[PDB]
């Protein structure tokens, strides 16, 4: 023991903290995990990265693949793309995806609207536009309100695996993690692959085991072979 | 935005959702993990599978090994085979084990009664009889009521690892997962084994760290060498 | 089913159970994971173990390394070394570290005071002195009250990974686990190392993703090369 | 302290090259005897060959 410096909570971190609590206490939040081999997507960026930027005037990142994979998973599992509004269950026939962006002063989740209708290049541009506004802090309340599902990337900080927190009134959240070289079994041979752990936190009131697991398996399948988005399999 | 189809929840899904919430909020649910090498059990099924079905008229699955291992663990750790009834702690001197079966309409959990008194062949017969009733939907209220402990298998859906949800008034739940070929250290050499992650979610009000961890270690020990059930070690 | 043996809870375990609930329901508890190579620390114990005990009259364990690493991480991330008092955030300018000790009568968490001021030998002596008092049950109310952060070691019981529970009014808890030989990627070659999973459960009201992840990465960095504690890098 | 020079050294019965420096301690033999002077300089050698010994204090 020694001394104590009390610092009061600002209007924001007071209501952010009240809302994370009311989220945790109002939902039956559970987390299902999976792993994904990133070499396929890393190879696409290594091969077509130059040609992609020349054609579209924006660099090909990972986030466009994650969004494209989440939208297809939201189509196959419409129970995950829903809210609970008191006594009603609201199924959304559109794909608005909340996406956590870093600002030095707090962390915000702006919304990408009608992502089902955007190309890979268009997605990466809308993320840069929202990410510039976040870093500068010029983000509208139009930009922050709504969203059916959140993607968070704690991998920028080197986290192996974690339990992400649901952003109500949303039902689920997908947590991206660090890409780490790990020995894997490949056709009965021990081969090193760049592996990432995926976490899906989901509300067990609305989403049962089969849907939560199957949703996250869908995302794993479409990240390990982006070509499956075209075939739809 | 586009359109949304809201459909109100009946007395059922309204109060099932309120009861999953009051369960989650009224217990101190935590999850401890472990891994198990399935090659020993996979080898027993490959070797004695034909001879077992001929003799008993029922196929040798994994679930008989899991039940046999859970019952022995419930005997060694009686704190896990208990409920909390308000101000009382109810220790059960019998082994009724809830067991999740896959049904087209969600997932249902019939109860196996006095499993301590059943042979491997008897267990596999009672599970097939309850699994047929689940798939057909001919499951009695006698069949669903009660149970001291739940075994859930999200591995049927290809989940790597997850936090299963306790089914009150029960204290704990064991989550089985996908069996995945993974490189393992065996006598200082890298050998590929079929590995499964085990998850035990437990009520920290009744079950402390030592009991929860030790219970799940017991199940790992008895699945990696089923011959330990006979020796009792 | 057969019979059931009902045992009442005294105010003993009645108010512990009520307080685990008010802890869980008053905090937004999340858990971030990481892994650490213990070979460096295991090699130091194998090399200097004899010479250390001769010089200080106390055996060199792992817990001195974990405490030394936690204190340095608490300095780099002061938001983790804090409590929430209603509308205030209380920053502590001292390092009192709660440390879970296993006793036949439940589990107790005595406090190590001003650990920032203790050498490796002093730490190991204070842990043995508090561990003897726990096993004997001669532990003071001075010894149990307070603490800014908890370290728990469920690895003594062979747990692979788990979600530790926050010890209010503290913000976070670090969970140590079993050391298991696992194949690891080292300069693109598969080498077997003695690996342990780390779990940090944290209150998301006060601790955001960047701090929680970065705190646990700091502990991993200082356990994989204890010589970084001296250099402070 | 002196120059660091690559020199062949005996290491677990194998000749391996290490970057070696000679240490000199000049001491007043009125106040410091052989055992203390030698033991002082051995301590410095031990703590420079493994700086992690400063943390453990061994
Ligand atoms: Na794979
Ligand atoms: Na194993
Ligand atoms: Na490592």
Author numbering:
A (entry chain C), B (entry chain A), C (entry chain B): 172 to 404
D (entry chain D): 347 to 404
Show the paper's wording.
In our attempts to crystallize amidase (EC 3.5.1.4) from Arabidopsis thaliana, we serendipitously crystallized the catalytic domain of E. coli dihydrolipoamide succinyltransferase (EC 2.3.1.61), which belongs to the family of α-keto acid dehydrogenase complexes, in a novel crystal form and without an expression tag. The structure lacks any observable electron density for the E3-binding domain, N-terminal lipoyl-binding domain or the associated linkers. It is likely that these domains are removed by endogenous proteases prior to or during the crystallization process. We have crystallized this enzyme in a new condition and in a new crystal form. The new crystallization precipitant contained only NaCl, which differs from the previously reported crystallization conditions as shown in Table 5. Even though EcDSCD is a well known highly crystallizable contaminant, its structure had never been reported in an I4 crystal form and SIMBAD did not find a hit when only searching the PDB unit-cell parameter database. Even in the I4 crystal form, the two trimers of the asymmetric unit adopt slightly different conformations, in which one trimer rotationally expands away around the threefold NCS axis of the trimer in comparison to the other trimer. Consequently, reconstruction of the 24-mer biological assembly using the asymmetric unit trimers and the fourfold crystallographic symmetry leads to a 24-mer that is slightly stretched outwards (skewed) compared with the 24-mer in the F432 form. Because of this conformational change, data in the I4 crystal form could not be processed in I422 and the packing is different from the previously reported F432 crystal form. Crystal-packing analysis shows an arrangement of a physiologically relevant 24-mer core complex in this structure, which provides additional insights into the organization of the E2 subunit of the E. coli KGDC.
